[PDB]
């Protein structure tokens, strides 16, 4: 890999610079290089990895949605035939998105998850696995769509099981996992009731544990609680 000659510490330093410059593709490439050094990632380093790829795939998803909407409109009654270009370009963006997802899943499988023994790291990585299978599911239309959905579900479920055993209900990783798994239920699994139940129960159990927290931990937990409430407001 092109980052094989760069020191681990230099890759991490450069990922931080890339973030400051809003160069998320570079950030992701640096962090991929850092992961491929083979050492486990610290919390801060896991955050850099996640932020980089979230931003890259987030932009690809937004572009894919724009293109998919144009494509759908082209297939409506009375829409003039404009040739294969819209489908081709949506496919191009889709293929690039799938590539990024496969890259992230590959880092998780080789070998981040297997080396992650602490609850905070293992839950974080399993959440990411669920997230990137979810992005694959968003664009899946073929023989494997069910298996992709199930891969997302399974990763999220293992993360949920660990989180509930090992982390307090206010822990931001537990909260963020539940937020995203709830979205999975609503948007991917056609299970809005499960989505709403998960968001509500997670919010309420967190509320009950806030009293244990410092001011700074309270701030972290309540920010994600508000995202849960925002989704509940959207869905009810």
């Amino acid at each position: 890999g092109a980052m094989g000659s760069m020191e681990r510490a230099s890759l991490i330093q450069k990922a931080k610079l890339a973030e400051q410059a809003e160069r998320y593709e570079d950030m992701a490439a640096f962090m991929k290089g850092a992961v491929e050094k083979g050492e486990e990632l610290s919390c801060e380093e896991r955050n850099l990895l996640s932020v980089a790829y979230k931003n890259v795939v987030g932009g690809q998803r937004a572009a894919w949605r724009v293109l998919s909407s144009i494509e759908q409109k082209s297939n409506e009654e009375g829409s003039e035939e404009k040739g294969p270009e819209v489908r081709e370009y949506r496919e191009k963006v889709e293929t690039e998105l799938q590539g990024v997802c496969d890259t992230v899943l590959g880092l998780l499988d080789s070998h981040l998850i297997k080396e992650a023994g602490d609850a905070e790291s293992r839950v974080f990585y399993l959440k990411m696995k669920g997230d990137y299978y979810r992005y694959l599911a968003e664009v899946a239309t073929g023989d494997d769509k069910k298996r992709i959905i199930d891969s997302a579900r399974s990763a999220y479920q293992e993360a949920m099981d660990i989180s509930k055993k090992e982390m307090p209900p206010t822990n931001p990783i537990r909260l963020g996992l539940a937020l995203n798994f709830s979205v999975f239920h609503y948007e991917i699994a056609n299970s809005p009731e499960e989505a709403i139940s998960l968001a509500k129960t997670t919010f309420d159990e967190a509320m009950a544990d806030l009293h244990t927290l410092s001011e700074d931990s309270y701030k972290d937990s309540t920010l994600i609680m508000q995202l849960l409430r925002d989704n509940l407001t959207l869905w009810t």
Partner: peptide, 5 residues
């Protein structure tokens, strides 16, 4: 679109 982190 709903919130995720």
């Amino acid at each position: 679109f709903p919130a995720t982190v």
